[PDB]
Structure formats: C-alpha cells, structure tokens
Amino acid sequence: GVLKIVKVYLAVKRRIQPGDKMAGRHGNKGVISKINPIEDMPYDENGTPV
C-alpha cells in the first residue's frame, strides 16, 4: 500500500566553523573556538604563520 517513492540525494559541502571537533591521534580532543585571520597568527622569523 504505497504507490511511489521519490528519493533525492543531497550533497552538502560542510567546511568548518567554531563548534566542530578536531583531534590528534594521541587523544587530545578539542573544539575549534575562534577562526582567526592569517594576520593574527604567531609567526616565526621566516614569516610562516602557524
């Protein structure tokens, strides 16, 4: 007793935002808190921002 089924596959592309969870392989969990611009990162004397 069902006539017809229409299935629709969405493909969402989710990037990253504060609130996601990230983790190294050693069990250091963490929630991303603020997503800073490149201008505010600590950088060494060669100039590469962490």
Binding site: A11, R15, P37, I38, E39, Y43, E45, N46, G47, T48, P49
Partner: protein
C-alpha cells in the same frame, strides 16, 4: 622627525621580492613592519576565479569523459589559478582543448586585458583523445576572502544550473616577513632599516602593493587627522 623613503627593490627569484626602506627612526621599524605586514597580508586588491561553466556538466559532483580528474579537483585547480586584469573588474575567459595530455593555463584563450602569470599551472589531464573539454571561467576583482555560501543571497537567478560557484580567495599575497636592522648613517648613530620580504602569487608588483597598503593605512588615520 626624519621621514622615510623607499630604496632598492630586489626581486629575488621570480615572484617574491625584498623591499628595503632605509631611513627610519627608533621604533618605527617594528611599527611600520607590523602595520604594513598586516595590511599587505590581509586586504590587497586581487582577482581570482569565481564562476566556472564546464560544457557537459550539470553539477560539480560528477564525472566527464576522458578527464582523469573529478570535477571538483578541476575546480580546486582553478582556485589556485593566479591571473591579473588590467582594465576591468570582471572578465570571462574560456578554455577549448582537445587531445591527450595536460591542460594548463597556457591553453586559456587570448585576451589583451588578461595576463596569465603561470603558463604551466596544470588544470586537468585528458585521456580518451576524443573527449574535448570546453569551459567558461569568470574571474573577478575582489578583496579578502568570500566563500560561495555568502554570495548566494540574490543568487542572480542561478537557473542556468551549469554555473559552478568557486570559493574565491582574492588575496594575492602568501607570506610577508620583515626584518628590522640598523642602517649605518653618517652622523646619526642609529636609524633602523626595514626590509619587507614579500611572497606573492605573481599578480601584484611590490611597490604598488606597499603604496596601496600605506594608502589604506593613512586613509584609516585621516578619520581624525587631516591633509598635510
């Protein structure tokens, strides 16, 4: 008191250049270093690929004949395409290519306003010898970083579903590192000399970049200062 003045620009290899800036007093070396580093690194005018329209593609989660790439790795290869525009603010380039082999940015069509800074930046490989790829790229001058989720408010009636919105990273710079060392001056003992090493993708010449950056900074300060 004593104001600076720019001196020799040294393009080191191809695309990254050291800009010296000799006559600076105490403290203004690190000051203008941090300030120009930030304003060059954050907000410089540049252009990147915004909309891509491949011929036989409904949407970016698909596959094409003869292309060994997927569609979204073609789009991520177009995101890194470094291009410059002379007398426009948006301009539509196109690709038409057939036959086995790599497809680079050198095979994008000819236009006098548009200059390609890397002819070897590989977009996509073709295999089947009959599968001709043909797309229309839309590059656009911009500022900062605008993802595809922010632009779709008015949506420009996206009913031509063959349009693929690419995240546009408009920033032409990649790394700005400054040194502050002392410049040996005739009578005055210590005057600091600034060296702003700057890595760009190749689209922006350095003197124009630093002139735009100092222009933006002085325009920010002239909110409560005035003309001099």
């Amino acid at each position: 008191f004593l104001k600076p003045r720019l001196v020799d620009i040294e393009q080191v290899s191809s695309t990254h250049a050291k800009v010296t800036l000799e006559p600076l007093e105490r403290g203004f070396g690190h000051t203008l270093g941090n300030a120009l580093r930030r304003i060059l690194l954050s907000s410089m005018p540049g252009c990147a690929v915004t909309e891509v329209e491949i011929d036989g593609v409904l949407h970016e989660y698909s596959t094409k004949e003869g292309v060994q790439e997927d569609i979204l790795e073609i789009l991520l290869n177009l995101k890194g395409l470094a291009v410059r525009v002379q007398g426009k603010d948006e301009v539509i380039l196109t690709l038409n290519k057939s036959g086995i082999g790599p497809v680079t940015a050198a095979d994008i069509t000819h236009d006098g306003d548009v200059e390609i800074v890397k002819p070897q930046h590989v977009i996509c490989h073709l295999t089947d010898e009959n599968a001709s790829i043909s797309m229309r790229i839309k590059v656009q001058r911009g500022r900062g970083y605008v993802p595809a989720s922010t632009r779709i408010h008015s949506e420009e009636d996206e009913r031509p579903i063959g349009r693929l919105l690419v995240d546009a990273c408009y920033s032409p710079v990649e790394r700005i590192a400054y040194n502050v060392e002392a410049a040996r001056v005739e009578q005055r003992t210590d005057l600091d000399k600034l060296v702003i090493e700057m890595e760009t993708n190749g689209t922006i010449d350095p003197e124009e970049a630093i002139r735009r950056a100092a222009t933006i900074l002085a325009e920010q300060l002239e909110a409560f200062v005035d003309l001099e």
